[PDB]
Amino acid sequence: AQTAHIVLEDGTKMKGYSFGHPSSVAGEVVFNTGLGGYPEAITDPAYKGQILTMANPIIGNGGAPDTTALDELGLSKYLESNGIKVSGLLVLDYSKDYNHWLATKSLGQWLQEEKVPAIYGVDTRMLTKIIRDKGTMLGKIEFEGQPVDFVDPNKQNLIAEVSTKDVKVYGKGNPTKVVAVDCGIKNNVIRLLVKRGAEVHLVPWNHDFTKMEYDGILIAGGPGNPALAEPLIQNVRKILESDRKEPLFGISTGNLITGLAAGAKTYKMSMANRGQNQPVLNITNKQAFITAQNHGYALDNTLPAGWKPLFVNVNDQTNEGIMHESKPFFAVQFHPEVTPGPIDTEYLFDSFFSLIKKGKATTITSVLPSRVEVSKVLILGSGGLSIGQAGEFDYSGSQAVKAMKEENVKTVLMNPNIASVQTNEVGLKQADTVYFLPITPQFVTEVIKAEQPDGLILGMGGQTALNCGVELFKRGVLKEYGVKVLGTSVESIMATEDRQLFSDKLNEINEKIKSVTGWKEIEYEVVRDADDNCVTVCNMENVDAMTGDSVVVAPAQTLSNAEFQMLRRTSINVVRHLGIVGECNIQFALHPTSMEYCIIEVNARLSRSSALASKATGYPLAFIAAKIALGIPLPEIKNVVSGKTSACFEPSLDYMVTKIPRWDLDRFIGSSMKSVGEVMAIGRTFEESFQKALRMCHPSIEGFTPRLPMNKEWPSNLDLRKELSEPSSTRIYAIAKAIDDNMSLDEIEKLTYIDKWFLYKMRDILNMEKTLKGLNSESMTEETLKRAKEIGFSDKQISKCLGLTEAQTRELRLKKNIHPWVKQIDTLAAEYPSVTNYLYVTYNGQEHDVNFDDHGMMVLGCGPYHIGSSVEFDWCAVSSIRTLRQLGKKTVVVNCNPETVSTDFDECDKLYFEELSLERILDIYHQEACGGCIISVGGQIPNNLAVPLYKNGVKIMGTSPLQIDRAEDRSIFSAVLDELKVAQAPWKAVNTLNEALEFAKSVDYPCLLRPPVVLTKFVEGAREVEMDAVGKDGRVISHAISEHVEDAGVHSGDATLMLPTQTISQGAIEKVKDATRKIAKAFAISGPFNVQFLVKGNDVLVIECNLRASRSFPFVSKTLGVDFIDVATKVMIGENVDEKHLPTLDHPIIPADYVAIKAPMFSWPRLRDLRCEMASTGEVACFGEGIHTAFLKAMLSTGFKIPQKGILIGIQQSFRPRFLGVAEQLHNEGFKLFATEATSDWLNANNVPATPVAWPSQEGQNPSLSSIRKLIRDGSIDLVINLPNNNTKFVHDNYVIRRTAVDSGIPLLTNFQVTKLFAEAVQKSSKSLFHYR
């Protein structure tokens, strides 16, 4: 475009691109924090003379409506006045491509038609920070060759400029005559009057209405200094001094004029009130309301005789309305007609008409009409399985703990996982008492009996805690012990959980719960307090839904004001009607080309949505929900981010967030291919946020690209329309390919259901990539590179377009001084200064929001959870960050996983919720000038960056990245082991097919393969042992040896661990230790490390070494009473450690009186091709007198009933001789045995009783044999053993069997060693077994 500058009178200059009328304009520069409804906004007469800075960084998504259409009254149908009223517009990103069913044209076309200048590409947040609290900031949009001077339009009578010049009548023939004095009235005021039976006589600002006949009078505006409207003030003064008693209703300018006429004073506010999130309080009844405001002048708080304040601003204590003590005269400083904004104060129009209908009264007459004492509260933590629900982690319980501690309420927390991150807490988040018990009705009853709490929080531990609290309620246990449910009542909860009860409750307020395919899916997070104050804190739009695992953006992007405000209001109505006291999530389907919607569901407990919404906004939902449960109202709770304002507000976001689920694709489609984590990315364009989130999913992902990752090729036979219409693991790449193959966007939207707005942004990314591909290091301009970075291109992406390396591209970019900017997530779009340390990084800006004087220690997080990289690394993070804090070291945390506890800006000095790439970590490290980086405590992601960080100026703490590299290179590590005389299984990296075959024969079958391919001899019937350890200058100073239950196999990171060892020889232990001593010296280890070993009798073979903390670090730490991460962090930073009491190699800590077990929280089958495997995640860790009781306690802790009745036996035919003994053992403990016919017959022929059952695929073929499903449903089978079976005819049935157990919530054993452990433990052996601290 042509470019133009925004120049402020203080000297601030920002260059932007013109998208409106290309001429210069001068005016007052203002900002408004309201995000939605820019068409309604920019037609507000209040902006006359003003250049408006938009908080919402993404402007124009809905285009412009039909700007000439009129409604039945002769008013603009879709606008708030007869044209655009702003003098100009300043935005971060202008969407040239729009998509909305009411759009007729682009916002830029509209602006051009109206002659309004507008520029994009300017830092609207920086402009906000500059304008705020200055009173009047003059500025100008200036084009080259069109110089203009600063002018203050407030020095002229703007009221007169916008007022009607003659009397206009709307609602002709209606019964109630209302005179409206036009001080820049909005159209919606007139619509709301007429709807109520007014015939509205709209009169000029200076019309002498004083002797007119009317039933009521209304004054509304608008722009300008109310003091310049003396003829109006004098006329209103005449009314007030008369004996006229018609009701008077002032809106905004009305409030000021009515005040002045009464004898009050007005002033020009240092800090104006302009937003759609402005909290006010009715001073009379303490009720809070969220309002739309757009005023820069206010009434002085000293009011004249006969007048009282009606509303007050909750943030800044300014007047927000006045009322006469006896006459029906009142005004409000906000806009109850909204448009845009929250439809929460429309009842003021009802009040006005009520006053007219009586024969006199006050507005008070017709206006709408810590209490619980708790001394000890029981908080139900994150628990086990919930039948027909995915499996959840939810540690929000700890925020509840923190809230209770600030109110001097004693806390008891239940969490059965002894190594949970939730209980790894030592300050405000530590419960006074923790019980390590299952989250089940029996156990929670025992804690109630023991502790005698008077309150219970049941809505902050996921579905299982909820089901549990509800069951205690139903059985009378809560009544019996005097335990109050804090927050939403169980009666209200039951109404949301039962589909039918929910429908009936909704039908009472004329709302409703068929295919919603291709409807827009929008969700709101809502908080309601015990005083019936009810706010929306976040809203989200599903980009693409393929069970709650959608790609989501926040805020919603494609809604109009009408749609957004319609759903927002329904949310509030539904939440209040349901009796919510705390948080609630509500999900809508909205028809994509009308106003029709329906409610999909409500969730009256904390959820993945509420955790995402807290991360996206910085509003601490769980903490606030816990304060609400104590009956504290929103206005009386602090906004933790601002420090100076309350929880009674709706966040305004000057960035956009993108969340993407993390799919289970690491092992290498939808049948058993689930969401195992999530990422969230922040940007100030959609594109920036979007590419960043894609990269966050996995390091092989470059951004948005039509090329499959890992250099794979699209099939030659590809049917693209087919790929687009069914979920796949390559869906996003298929969309990119469709766009790039010139499939129309309309067709892509028809096939995918993704709104075309999003597809336009995707197309711009691909178009940028084409632009970049015709350029080179010499010809690419600064402007192009800047734009590419602003829409989320990485240096690596750019490098492939230009034919450069990544490093050369970074260098090139920094030579042009193109770098990103550190912004704060402040919850208020800069309305108030924040001192938050909750940060992101964007190219869309012109300043940083923080200083870089800390020079802190960086700690890198683990990225999205997935199989093998789970909650254990959150525990490691928490411990390492606390060690640093305890030693007085400033910390910088970087992570992008919104499910983590460690991304808590209250526990670290700077939290960057950012991409864990080399590029972004270097940006953050060098901008902060960090003193070092810890890459050892976040799993593989950070550790794999060791060497690239080290080569780019990063000080890595602890073990040299050069050593990490040697140890994790198979060829180098193996030659080091050869030289030290440490054994390992034979192995080869093979190029050719004839090489692979010759090796497989050189050492006998089988062999293991893994990604030029690595062959290793597979050793059969071996044990596996984990060594977790901490080195210091090459000396092992802490170690723990654990033993896998399962024989060494293809699964490791699926294995159940026993500590200390149970069936390992003493000689093998000595060899494990000796090998560990040698490895630590050979790699000069200073920090955490793990070595895995195969053991067979006395033969000990190293499998591999990971020179970083492993997932078993929490487990071994809690088991031995020594925090291995604490010790390692100390070593890595050079802090001294006393070794006298550590588990060194010469003096191990071997528990005597107990054994610990670590097992997966959730397991489920996966169909492959042909075979069936298990996947598992999460952790449960328990202690027991021995491994047998530990194991039973783990089973109860994961939410299972210990089997008693019947066992389904499924084994491969060749495994029969080995299994017969265990079968008899299980039978001799009183289990009835079931098996498929041939197995059943074989058992019976060996004198082990069994009952035959049908294979699922053959249930038709014989009505005489029982079905597995029926035997499970009726409780005959309460355990399924289903061991590996390579018979390909039954692979699918074995998958079905396994899926049935998992879905019915009964235990499923798929390994022989684990089956033997169970069999032994039930010989050996619910309440009795357990535990606590």
Ligand SMILES: Cc1csc(NC(=O)C2CCN(C(=O)N(C)Cc3ccc(F)cc3)CC2)n1
């Ligand atoms: C090895 C591995 C582990 S995880 C992984 N790849 C991913 O996680 C990708 C799969 C492709 N993918 C995808 O198709 N998505 C999420 C659909 C999508 C739809 C709309 C969007 F806006 C973005 C993504 C994203 C993540 N690869």
Ligand SMILES: [Zn+2]
């Ligand atoms: Zn105000």
